[PDB]
């Protein structure tokens, strides 16, 4: 019996989920491990790009034996066209890595060192897009009615925290109207 | 300027020496021993020390402090105090 | 000048103290609030830029507008009408300054200060924006007061023939703000010398207003300056000071943080939760725990029963400290005032200049009339400390007879007859006549003559100081330990460390509690008590069978009833316990004993 | 007597295990110099993810209460601060266990002389002598190789004289002032630098660790600035700002002062509670008091401005401050204040002097928290210990401010109680040495911490003698509150006014051993620190007479 949350996913859970996503890195390394579902790999070439699951990358990076690739989608200069595209589209939320919130929080824990001036940089940049995305949630949130929601593009993290909000809502709405029938 | 302070150690005697200064002093008159009255002895002591410029309470500072209070309380007594005089001798 | 804006905007954005930046958070935090406000940490500000702080400190008044007009900028970014300018409050705790010293040097200098307010003016408007038109040219214009130090700073421009200054006010289109006009006084403790304490008018605007109760101990910041006014010289201007920001010691304010409830819940769980407070009230004090205990029951506030009809139970009771000097009761109430969030210490006469009667006074200008105030009103809904209650002039002493029960004062003075509400809980410390022998006498023949004064009182205490050797030497040495090296004072740390109340938090605890629970007695407690006093009512009359003169009322029982919720309120329980009641009986029994003597 | 790396490499084969490991660092004990070296090492294994125990040992014999308590699977071991004097083969015994022994012990001590049993008889050791004093120190070679294995009556009598010759020689060594060589973290950092790792934190830690004993001379440390100064040269995060940056935001060299709580207090009291300022200016008295104010009259400083926070000092007051110092302080002999010692810069959270950074950590030691009570209280010091270890953490700075503030609370009573003592003239001049005792005072519990009177004594010894002619001397001190005349007695040594020509070491510590080898009634070596001892007032009086004579120095 979970008690809490328990219906919504924990942010610690969803990040625990996003850990499962594969990404390329630059190992210092040159048994097996067989593991289970990895399928990878032959002992990896030092200073070479290879796609691997996220949390394992945290491992060798935790020993600093590996160098994680920066997301191509993660370019602050590149990200402005999104906020550019976002600032000109009051409706659409544009495009998302879909895990990216936890990433940046996690990316800057350790892997921060790999990027060029991530410091004092995207954190603000990402933050602006974070709320401008978030603000557009509530602005469209006034439209909220049963039985349909066009949620479109949103980061699941905020989607998770918003879960208790609307899920508790429309059920009232759907109930009250349908009950009214 | 000068701010005298007692050391609790040797001051324990007064709490002991006062016990002589209440009940036996209570034995005559009504009482007239007061809780406040004891508080005075310290305000008494603080004076001579600054006069000594010691910055802290000394025994000699108390020596007057008690004696100042002893007969002071004594004179309040009736002529029967002449008998009350002889017991206070221990507090000298 | 310009573009210094973005530098704050940078600290508005560029700034992140790891792991999370603040003011940029605070803004959106205030956004949905529609708070239209920001509280700045200035001591934090220097941490960002060292230059702009003193660069701000040079002429802070002029860079005031450089903020809220800037804060809207990204706020407007985050808003994406109409959007009124936010109200910033910057604050610092670092070097506190005495009211005793205000140097003209400090003009246009921001200064954090502690203070004790006399009072504050009723709120009045200031128009942040206005539209104005030529009474002649039909020319359309608009003006704003974007910021100000009252000057008057601005007036109608005379350039529209047409003139002079044909432009005129339009209020409808104009937009407005408020000001409190606080009058603050220095802390009484220091350093008035023999001289009377200076008093000062502090300027509170918009959100600044209504933020502080009159008479409260407060810490405040703002700018020293001078206004010529007119209503001095040659060409001398009267002193005034801006308030920004005011971060006042909590409360010094019904709301509070959530985790506070929990730590109190930790206290509410304690079996000794009441008994520890028995020690907390008297760190320096020795004995008289019954009277000591009798303190707390009144501390939580009395029974308020408003259910129809308009008849309502009062609070909080009455108590008498009467006993020979060396009772330390006046010293006691001095602790009492410190313990009450709102209380008035009165030894009078009145205290200090305060009318023991809330009284009427005329307005100097424009004649008219107003309530001049009264101690009952000053402390209303709270603690009342009284000394020399026997030395009180009996005429306004009469007003006391009313103040305690009906708890509403009314005076016909001039044209204003209005009936004020007084919810205060009074306690009488007045010394008994002729020392010990009055106990050899009737219990009465002390207050006035009649005990009808006692009638309005509830728990009245007669201190019996007996000269017991061991009893004195205990507290006797306890006294010396109170002194240097303050051995007793160091004992509280381990009492603070392990259990014992800090008593300032406790005040917050009580204030928490006082507003929290509304305990209603269990049905069987009353019948336990109904069976109780009926004996006491019957028994004391058995003492009255000798025609012995001393006393009893049904109001005597009702007072006891308020003791039921008293400690029970400390328990926080919704209903009074059966077991809980009993201590009130034996405790009030100790009060009844005073009648027994 | 081995290179650190291979010794560290030696643990590597002994390291990784499941269940791990097994080795246990010993935190021993009170002195912070171990603390930095632990975390750097603590971080070292973090890099390798090496599991192990962390024990904040306090009692000198407490390790015996522990080593004799929990040792099971431990295949390897490292200790800190101890063993440089007394042998654990005697202390533990040991008992050679299985050549290719099952367990080995790294022994960290910066104090000399090393124990005779340390280097030779390599067992758990791994003698820690490397690389400081090898030396030689060729004297220990005759303490064994000559000693071992040791007409015929002539050759027999000839050997014994040679034996007594070496015994007579060996008798001097190991009987001698126990003194620290250098901050252990430095050599550990050398090993840290040996593996190639240099972390601005880690160097800061050396900067931190180096600072630990800085209150007591250097002495090598004076040349150890540059060793660190080279490092600040070895590392330049950028050529220029790059403002702030909001993150790193890193340390830089500054004109540091013996002035206390510089950034963290009003400059006025900053002089007032500064110990170096104390005796030089005779701060306790009213006479020299105004003279400092006279310096503000020289400095052109408003008295209230001295009352002002260091945060808000005018930029003029800032930039001209040292120049004001340049034009003033030298007149009073205050010219040796300014130090180029390094300062961390947290920007938004502010820059801090490691010296100042240290003192806050020092406040953690005594506060921020029958015979069982002392173990209970010593445990509280250990209970209070980790909270101080918590203060080692970087992100947690807010908690530091308590000690930051509490340190200010310390000297307030520190500067308070001591000066009170000054009025009574309680020093016993004696002849051989200056001597003192505290029979009474408020809050001796706070004085129960050795560092309390230690910072106090140092605040005293330099106060009582600047000099203050003639002949700077070791100080006597004792104090008592409760626990039946415990009377903690800590050793004290004279301070030169910036002119330590000689090591001069320690004497009484040997002399304290003289009485502990004597009737030794109520005297307690229970203190890990040789300079500090527990004694009953009842037996200390004769202990004093036994202390007065025979004087070893
Ligand atoms: N229970 C007690 N605890 C602590 N101090 C006490 C107690 N009883 C008496 N004293 C001491 O006796 C003195 C009484 O002085 P104080 O002025 O408080 O008397 P009082 O009872 O308030 O005067 P009055 O009776 O006129 O109201 C104080 O110094 C106080 O320390």
The size of the B-C interface in CB pairs under 8 A is 55
8 A C-beta contact, residue B34 and residue C326: yes
Taken in order A160, A162, A168, A170, the sign of the CA dihedral is: negative
Report the gap between the CA of B46 and the closest CA in chain D (Å): 16
Q: Which of D75, D178, D115 is nearest to D530 (CA)?
A: D178
Q: Which of residues 234-253 of D touch A (CB under 8 A)?
A: 244-248
Question: In the structure encoding, which two tokens stand for residue A7, read together?
Answer: 């219906």
- State both tokens at D465: 């003698």
Paired sense of beta strands D488-490 and D532-534, if any: antiparallel
Distance C488 CA to ligand 1 centre (A): 17
The closest alpha carbon to C250, from C239, C260, C264, C262, belongs to C260
Q: Measured between beta carbons, which residues in chain B are less than 8 angstroms from residue D416?
A: none
Report the Cα D27 to chain-centroid distance in Å: 14
**How far is residue C414's CA from residue D202's CA, in Å, rounded to a whole number?**
80
Calculate how far, in angstroms, residue C379's C-alpha sits from the geometric centre of ligand 1.
Answer: 25
Q: Closest approach of chain D CAs to the CA of C374, in angstroms? A: 40
Pocket probe for ligand 1: among C319, C320, C326, C461, the residue whose CB has the most ligand atoms within 8 Å is: C326
The alpha-carbon gap from D319 to the nearest alpha carbon of chain A, in Å, equals 29
Q: Which of A106, A131, A134 to mutate to test the interface with C (most CBs of C within 10 A)?
A: A131
Helices C259-269 and C273-280: angle between axes, nearest 10 degrees = 100
Give the Cβ contact number of residue A28 at 10 Å.
Answer: 13
What is the token pair recorded at C120? 């504050």
Nearest residue to B15 (alpha-carbon basis) of D188, C478, D338? C478
State how far Cα C232 lies from the chain centre: 35
Q: Are the CB atoms for C116 and C215 separated by under 8 Å?
A: yes
Q: For D217, left (φ over 0), alpha (ψ -120 to 50), or beta?
A: left
- Beta-carbon separation of A131 and C14 below 8 A: no
Q: Are D162 and D96 in contact, with CB atoms under 8 Å apart?
A: no
Which chains pack against C, by 3+ Cβ pairs within 8 A? Answer: A, B, D
- CB-CB under 8 Å, C78 with A123: no
Q: How far apart are CA D186 and CA B82, in angstroms?
A: 82
Centroid of ligand 1 to alpha carbon of C292 (angstroms) = 13
- What is the full DSSP assignment across D71-98? -SS---EEE-S-SSSS-HHHHT------
Residues 37..96 of A with a Cβ closer than 8 Å to D: which? 62-64
**Residues of chain C contacting B61 with CB distance shorter than 8 Å:** none
Structure tokens at D36: 């930095």
C330 labeled part of a ligand binding site? yes
Ligand 1 centroid to residue B25 C-alpha, Å: 20
- Nearest CA among C50, C47, C1, C52 for reference residue C21: C47
| Cα B21 to middle of ligand 1, angstroms | 19
* Residue C222 labeled ligand binder: no
Mutation choice for ligand 1 from C320, C328, C330, C386, CB with most ligand atoms inside 8 A: C328
C436: contact with B, CB 8 A cutoff? yes
Check whether C323 is labelled as a binding-site residue: yes
Report the DSSP beta bridge partners of residue D359: none
The residue of chain D nearest to residue C14, with distances taken between CA atoms, is: D246
Fold of domain C258-596:
Rossmann fold (3.40.50)
Cα of C60 from ligand 1 centre, angstroms: 51
Cα separation, C206 vs C64, in Å, equals: 15
Residues of D with CB under 8 A from a CB of C: 244, 246-247, 266, 307-309, 311-312, 314-315, 347-350, 395, 441-443
Cited resolution, angstroms: 6.1
Of C327, C345, C468, the residue with max ligand 1 atoms within 8 A of its CB, to mutate for a pocket test, comes to C327
**Interatomic CA distance for residues C4 and C558, integer angstroms:** 68
**Method underlying the structure:** cryo-EM
Question: Taking a C-beta distance cutoff of 8 angstroms, is the pair A119, C14 a contact?
Answer: no
Instruction: Say whether residue A121 is in contact with chain C using an 8 A CB cutoff.
Output: no
User: Contact D198/D192 with Cβ under 8 angstroms?
Assistant: yes
**Ligand 1 neighbourhood includes C325 CB (under 6 angstroms):** yes
Task: State which of C294, C331, C337, C467 you would mutate to test the pocket of ligand 1, scoring each by most atoms of that ligand within 8 A of its C-beta.
Answer: C331
- Is any ligand 1 atom within 6 A of the Cβ of residue B43? no
Phi, psi angle pair for D474, to nearest 5°: -65, 145
Which DSSP string corresponds to C329-382? Answer: HHHHHHHHHHHSSSEEEE-SSSSSS--SS-EEE--SSS---EEEE-HHHHT-SS
C328 in contact with ligand 1, CB cutoff 6 A:
yes
Q: Which residues of D436-454 are buried (b: 16+ CB within 10 A; e: fewer)?
A: bbbeebbbbbbbbbbbbbb
Q: Is the dihedral of CA D348, D351, D354, D359 positive or negative?
A: negative
- Whole-angstrom CA distances from C159 to C132, C135, C164, C473, D334 are 12, 12, 8, 88, 67
Measuring CA to CA, which residue among B10, B7, B18 is closest to residue B40? Answer: B18
What atom of ligand 1 comes closest to residue B34's alpha carbon?
12
- List the beta bridge partners of residue D339: D256
Chains B, A in contact, 3 or more Cβ pairs below 8 Å: no
Pairwise CB contact (< 8 Å): A124 & C78: no
Nearest to D309 among C50, C94, C487 (CB): C94
Report CA(C339)–ligand 1 centroid distance (Å). Answer: 18
Residue C120 Cβ contacting ligand 1 at under 6 Å: no
Is the link from the previous residue into D95 a cis peptide, with omega within 30 of 0? yes
Q: How crowded is the C-beta side of C593, counted as CA atoms within 13 Å?
A: 13
Nearest CA to ligand 1 atom 10: C328
Contact at 8 Å (CB) between D393 and D357? no
Q: What sign results for the dihedral spanned by CA atoms D366, D371, D373, D376?
A: positive
The residues in D 433-472 lying below 8 A from B, measured between CB atoms, are 440
- Are C297 and C542 in contact, with CB atoms under 8 Å apart? no
Which of C13, C48, C73 to probe the A interface (max A CBs under 10 A)?
C13
Q: Tell me how far apart the alpha carbons of residues C220 and D375 are, in angstroms, rounded to a whole number.
A: 48
Whose alpha carbon is nearest atom 19 of ligand 1?
C328
With tokens 């010894």, the residue in question is D461
Nearest residue on chain B to D424, alpha-carbon basis:
B54
Ligand 1 atom 17, closest CA: C328
C85 known member of a binding site: no
Interface test with A, best of D247, D248, D348 (most A CBs within 10 A): D247
C328 is in an annotated binding site: yes
- According to DSSP, the residues that pair with C199 across neighbouring strands are C185
- Helix (H) / strand (E) containing C37: strand C37-41
Rounded to whole angstroms, how far apart are CA atoms C73 and C403? 55
Distance in angstroms (rounded) separating the CA atoms of residues D192 and D201? 12
CA–centroid distance, C86 to ligand 1, in Å, is: 54
Q: What is the 3-state secondary structure (H, E, C) of C540-594?
A: HHHHHHHCCCCCCCHHHHHHHHHHHHHHHHHHCCCEECHHHHHHHHHHHHHHHHH
Distance CA B21, CA B37 (A): 10
């Amino acid at each position: 019996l979970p008690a809490h949350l328990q219906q919504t996913f924990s942010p610690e859970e969803i990040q625990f989920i996003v850990e499962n996503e594969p990404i390329k890195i630059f190992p210092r390394i040159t048994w097996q491990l067989i593991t289970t579902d990895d399928k990878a790999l032959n002992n990896m070439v030092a200073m070479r790009s290879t796609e691997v699951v996220l949390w394992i990358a945290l491992l060798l990076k935790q020993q600093s034996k590996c160098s994680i690739v920066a997301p191509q989608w993660l370019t602050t200069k590149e990200l402005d066209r999104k906020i550019q595209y976002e600032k000109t589209h009051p409706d659409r939320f544009s495009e998302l890595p879909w895990n990216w919130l936890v990433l940046a929080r996690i990316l800057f824990n350790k892997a921060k060192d790999d990027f060029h001036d991530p410091i004092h940089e995207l954190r603000g940049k990402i933050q602006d897009l974070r709320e401008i995305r978030q603000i557009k949630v509530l602005k469209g949130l006034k439209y909220l009615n049963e039985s349909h929601l066009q949620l479109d593009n949103l980061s699941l993290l905020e989607i998770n925290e918003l879960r208790p909000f609307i899920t508790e809502i429309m059920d009232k709405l759907r109930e009250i109207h349908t009950a009214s029938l | 300027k000068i701010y005298p302070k007692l050391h609790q150690m040797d001051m324990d005697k007064v709490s002991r020496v006062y016990a002589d200064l209440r009940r036996e002093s209570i034995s005559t008159g009504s009482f007239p021993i007061t809780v406040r009255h004891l508080e005075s002895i310290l305000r008494i002591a603080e004076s001579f020390a600054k006069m000594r410029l010691s910055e802290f309470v000394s025994s000699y500072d108390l020596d007057r402090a008690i004696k100042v209070v002893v007969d002071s309380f004594v004179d309040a007594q009736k002529v029967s105090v002449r008998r009350q005089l002889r017991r206070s001798f221990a507090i000298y | 000048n310009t573009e210094i804006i973005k530098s704050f905007k940078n600290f508005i954005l560029e700034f992140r103290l790891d792991s999370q930046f603040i003011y940029r958070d605070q803004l959106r935090n205030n956004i949905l609030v529609k708070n239209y406000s920001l509280t700045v940490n200035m001591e934090h500000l220097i941490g960002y830029n060292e230059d702009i702080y003193k660069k701000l400190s040079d002429e802070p008044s002029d860079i005031i507008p450089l903020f809220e007009t800037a804060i809207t900028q990204v706020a407007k970014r985050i808003s994406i009408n109409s959007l009124p300018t936010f109200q910033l409050i910057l604050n610092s705790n670092a070097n506190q300054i005495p009211l005793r010293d205000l140097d003209s040097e400090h003009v246009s200098k921001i200064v954090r200060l502690s203070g004790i307010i006399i009072s504050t003016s009723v709120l009045s408007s200031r128009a942040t924006y206005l539209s104005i038109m030529c009474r002649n040219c039909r020319h359309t214009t608009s003006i704003t007061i974007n910021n100000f130090n009252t000057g008057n700073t601005v007036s109608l421009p005379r350039s529209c023939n047409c003139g002079p200054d044909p432009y005129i006010i339009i209020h409808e289109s104009s937009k407005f703000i408020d000001q409190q006009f606080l009058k603050l006084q220095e802390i009484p403790e220091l350093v008035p010398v023999g001289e009377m304490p200076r008093n000062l008018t502090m300027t509170c605007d918009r959100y600044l207003t209504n933020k502080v109760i009159p008479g409260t101990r407060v810490t405040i910041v703002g700018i020293y300056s001078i206004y010529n006014s007119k209503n001095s010289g040659v060409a001398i201007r009267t002193p005034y000071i801006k308030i920004l920001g005011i971060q006042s010691d909590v409360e010094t304010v019904t709301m509070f943080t959530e985790e506070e409830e929990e730590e109190f819940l930790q206290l509410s769980r304690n079996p000794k939760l009441y008994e520890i407070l028995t020690n907390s009230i008297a760190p320096s004090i020795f004995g008289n725990e019954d009277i000591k205990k009798a303190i707390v029951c009144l501390l939580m506030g009395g029974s308020k029963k408003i259910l129809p009809d308009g008849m309502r139970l009062r609070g909080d009771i009455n108590v008498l400290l009467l006993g020979d000097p060396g009772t330390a009761k006046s010293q006691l109430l001095k602790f009492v005032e410190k313990v009450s969030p709102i209380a008035v210490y009165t030894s009078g006469k009145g205290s200090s200049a305060a009318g023991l009667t809330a009284s009427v006074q005329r307005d100097p200008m424009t004649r008219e009339f107003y309530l001049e105030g009264g101690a009952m009103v000053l402390a209303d809904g709270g603690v009342v400390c009284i000394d020399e209650f026997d030395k009180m002039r009996d005429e306004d002493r009469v007003a006391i007879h009313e103040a305690m029960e009906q708890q509403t004062i009314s005076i016909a003075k001039a044209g204003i007859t209005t009936v004020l509400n007084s919810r205060t809980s009074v306690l009488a410390a007045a010394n008994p006549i002729y020392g010990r022998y009055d106990d050899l006498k009737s219990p009465g023949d002390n207050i006035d003559f009649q005990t009808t004064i006692l009638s309005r009182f509830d728990m009245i205490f007669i201190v019996k100081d007996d000269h017991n050797e061991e009893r004195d030497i205990s507290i006797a040495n306890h006294v010396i330990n109170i002194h240097t090296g303050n051995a007793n004072a160091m004992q509280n740390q381990q009492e603070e460390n392990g259990s014992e109340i800090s008593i300032e938090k406790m005040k917050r605890y009580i204030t928490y509690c006082r507003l929290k629970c509304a305990p209603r007695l269990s049905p069987q407690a009353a019948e336990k008590l109904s069976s109780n006093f009926v004996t006491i009512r019957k028994q004391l009359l058995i003492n009255e069978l000798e025609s012995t003169e001393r006393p009893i009322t049904i109001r005597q029982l009702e007072a006891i009833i308020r003791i039921t919720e008293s400690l029970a309120k400390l328990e926080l329980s919704p209903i009074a316990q059966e077991r809980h009641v009993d201590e009130a009986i034996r405790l009030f029994q100790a009060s009844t004993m005073d009648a027994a003597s | 007597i081995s290179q650190f790396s291979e010794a560290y490499n030696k643990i590597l084969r002994n390291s990784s295990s499941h269940s791990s490991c097994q080795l246990v660092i010993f935190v021993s004990c009170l002195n912070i110099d171990a603390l930095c070296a632990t975390k750097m090492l603590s971080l070292l294994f973090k890099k390798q993810l090496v599991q192990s125990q962390i024990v904040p040992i306090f009692g000198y014999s407490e390790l015996r209460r522990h080593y004799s308590q929990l040792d099971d699977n431990i295949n390897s071991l490292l200790l800190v601060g101890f063993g440089g004097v007394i042998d654990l083969e005697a202390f533990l015994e040991i008992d050679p266990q299985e050549q290719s022994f099952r367990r080995d012990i790294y022994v960290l001590d910066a104090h000399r002389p090393w124990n005779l049993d340390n280097i030779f008889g390599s067992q758990i050791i791994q003698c820690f002598d490397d690389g400081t004093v090898d030396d030689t120190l060729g004297e220990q070679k005759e303490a064994y190789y000559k000693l071992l294995e040791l007409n015929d009556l002539s050759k027999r009598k000839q050997r014994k004289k040679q034996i007594h010759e070496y015994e007579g020689v060996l008798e001097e060594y190991y009987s001698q002032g126990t003194t620290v060589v250098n901050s252990i973290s430095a050599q550990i950092y050398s090993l840290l630098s040996a593996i190639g790792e240099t972390n601005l934190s880690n160097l800061w830690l050396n900067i931190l660790g180096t600072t630990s004993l800085d209150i007591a001379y250097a002495q090598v440390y004076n040349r150890l600035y540059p060793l660190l100064q080279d490092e600040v040269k070895r590392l330049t995060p950028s050529s220029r700002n790059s403002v702030k940056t909001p993150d790193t935001l890193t340390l830089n060299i500054q004109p540091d002062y013996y002035l206390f709580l510089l950034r963290h207090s009003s400059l006025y009291d900053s002089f007032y509670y500064s110990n170096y300022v104390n005796a030089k200016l005779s701060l306790w008295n009213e006479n020299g008091k105004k003279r400092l104010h006279k310096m503000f009259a020289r400095m052109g400083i408003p008295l209230s401005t001295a009352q002002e926070t260091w945060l808000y000092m005018d930029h003029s007051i800032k930039r001209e401050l040292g120049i004001i110092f340049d034009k003033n302080l030298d007149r009073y002999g205050l010219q040796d204040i300014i130090r180029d010692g390094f300062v961390r810069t947290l920007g938004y959270r502010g820059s801090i002097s490691a010296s100042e950074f240290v003192e806050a950590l020092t406040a953690l030691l005594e506060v921020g928290n029958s015979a069982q009570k002392l173990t209970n209280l010593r445990k509280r010091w250990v209970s209070n210990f980790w909270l101080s270890w918590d203060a080692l953490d970087d992100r947690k700075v807010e908690l530091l401010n308590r000690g930051i503030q509490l340190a200010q609370d310390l000297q307030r009573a520190i500067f308070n109680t001591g000066v009170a003592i000054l009025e009574k003239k309680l020093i016993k001049h004696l002849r051989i040495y200056r001597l003192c005792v505290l029979q009474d005072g408020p809050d001796l519990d706070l004085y129960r911490n050795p560092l309390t009177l230690l910072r106090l004594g140092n605040w005293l010894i330099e106060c009582c003698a600047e000099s203050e002619d003639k002949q700077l001397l070791p100080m006597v001190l004792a104090s008592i509150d409760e626990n039946t005349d415990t009377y903690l007695v800590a050793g004290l040594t004279p301070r030169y006014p910036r002119g330590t020509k000689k090591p001069i070491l320690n004497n009484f510590s040997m002399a304290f051993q003289q009485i502990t080898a004597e009737t030794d009634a109520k005297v307690r070596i229970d203190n890990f620190e040789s300079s500090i001892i527990e004694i009953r007032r009842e037996d200390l009086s004769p202990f004093l007479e036994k202390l007065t004579l025979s004087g070893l120095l």
